[PDB]
Structures are given as C-alpha cells and as structure tokens.
Amino acid sequence: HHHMRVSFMVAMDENRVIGKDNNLPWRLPSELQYVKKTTMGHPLIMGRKNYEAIGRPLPGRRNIIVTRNEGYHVEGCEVAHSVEEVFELCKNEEEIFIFGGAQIYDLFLPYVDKLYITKIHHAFEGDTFFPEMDMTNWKEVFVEKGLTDEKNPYTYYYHVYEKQQ
Ligand SMILES: NC(=O)c1ccc[n+]([C@@H]2O[C@H](COP(=O)([O-])OP(=O)(O)OC[C@H]3O[C@@H](n4cnc5c(N)ncnc54)[C@H](OP(=O)(O)O)[C@@H]3O)[C@@H](O)[C@H]2O)c1
Ligand SMILES: CCc1nc(N)nc(N)c1C#CCc1cc(OC)cc(-c2ccncc2)c1
Ligand code: NI
Secondary structure, eight states: OOSSEEEEEEEEEEEEEEEEEOOOSSSHHHHHHHHHHHHHTTTTTEHHHHHHHHHHHOTSSOOEEOOOOOOOOOOOEEESSSSSHHHHHHHTOOOOEEEEOOOHHHHHHGGEEEEEEEEESSSSOOOOEEOOOOTTTEEEEEEEEOOBBBTSSSSSEEEEEEEEO
16 A cells, blocks of 8 residues: 555664663664665654753754654654554655664554565574564565774674565
8 A cells, every 4th residue: 555665774782772761772883874764864763762862863864753743842843643654654655664663663663665684693682672573475675794993893794675575
C-alpha cells in the first residue's frame, strides 16, 4: 500500500543492545558521521523517547516524532501518532529512515525493506534491545569495517541488507 522505501537505521552490540538508561552505551563519533552521511536529506522517524534524548531537531532532514500523545508539539518537528499517519506524511518520499528506539523498531518491523545495521564487537551493559529478525529472503549488499582509533575505541562493521521479497 505504501510506496516509500522503509529503511531501518540502527547500531547494536553483539547481544543486540542499543541503549542503556535512556542513552547510548558507547561513543563512536565516526559511526555517527556515517549515520549523518547516509540519512542526509531523508526523513528520520523517531520514537518520542529517542527524540527527547537527542534533544533537538536534526538539520537537513524532516524530523518525525512518533507518540500516542495527541497534544504533543515540538518546534521544527512533525508529530505522528501511528504507522499509517507516518505513511500519510511520507507518501511522496523516496526513502525514510526508522531511527529508533526499540518500541518504534518493533512498530515498523513488518514494513522494513532495507536494513542499515552497524554491529559493534563488544558486549555492553544495556536495557534496550533491537528486535530479532528473520533474514530469510534478505541479502547483504554492503559490508565495511568501521574506523577504530583513539577516538573510536571499539571494533564494529557497517552492514546493509535488502529485502528481496
Ligand atoms: N543504538 C541505536 O541505533 C539507537 C537508536 C535509537 C534509540 N536508541 C536508544 O533506545 C532507547 C529508547 O528506546 P525506547 O524503546 O525506550 O523508546 P522509543 O522507541 O524511542 O520511544 C517510545 C515511545 O514511542 C511512542 N510509541 C511507542 N509505541 C507507539 C505506538 N504504537 N503508537 C504511537 N506512539 C508509540 C511512545 O511515546 P509516548 O510515551 O509519548 O506516547 C513511547 O513512549 C534509548 O536508550 C535510546 O538511546 C538507540
Ligand atoms: C549514533 C548511533 C546510531 N547509529 C546508528 N547506526 N543508527 C542509529 N539510529 C543511531 C542512533 C541513535 C540515537 C541518538 C541518541 C542521541 O543522544 C542520546 C543522539 C543522537 C544523535 C547525535 C548527533 N547527531 C545525530 C543523532 C542519536
Ligand atoms: Ni587507527
């Protein structure tokens, strides 16, 4: 029914941890640069909790916040209250990025066409997890090692998977 490409944008560790105490468990400025590079000029779909942790609209992108709160408003952001409302707001977009967190990844999981997933080779303490996925009829179309240096202290890889079906 929907004609935009629904892409997940996520970074997780070896046990699918994405968050700890409503924040990121790691700092990888280089990984964040990849995110900015890949998401330039495309809508970001964010769970209300994800957005409020970020704290500000991200520039050069439509910021869409998913909440059940019908009175929720943020300057410089758009507000949606369901998957279908997001689809209406984005009906003419080429590609949208589901930017997290876990509740929002769960929400859009039946509709995901493309997965941009960074895998971090470390086991962090965490409380928030990326959902399990069946990768039947998906294919890895890109893989590259991330930059590990004094400012990026973990090993990690960028992966891109595309749904065939
Ligand atoms: N590593 C990564 O790639 C990454 C990415 C993003 C986030 N994170 C982390 O993940 C954590 C946040 O994830 P989270 O799951 O706790 O929160 P979240 O998914 O970002 O947002 C949860 C909120 O989304 C709204 N929501 C949930 N289901 C909805 C529905 N069916 N319809 C309309 N609105 C709905 C609700 O807002 P209301 O309560 O206002 O109704 C809910 O409280 C943080 O630790 C964050 O740092 C990590
Ligand atoms: C950067 C990891 C990340 N990597 C990947 N591959 N996908 C993601 N969805 C996220 C993520 C996230 C959630 C997130 C939380 C946050 O503070 C708590 C700040 C940002 C952010 C800071 C500066 N420019 C833009 C965004 C993003
Ligand atoms: Ni180095």
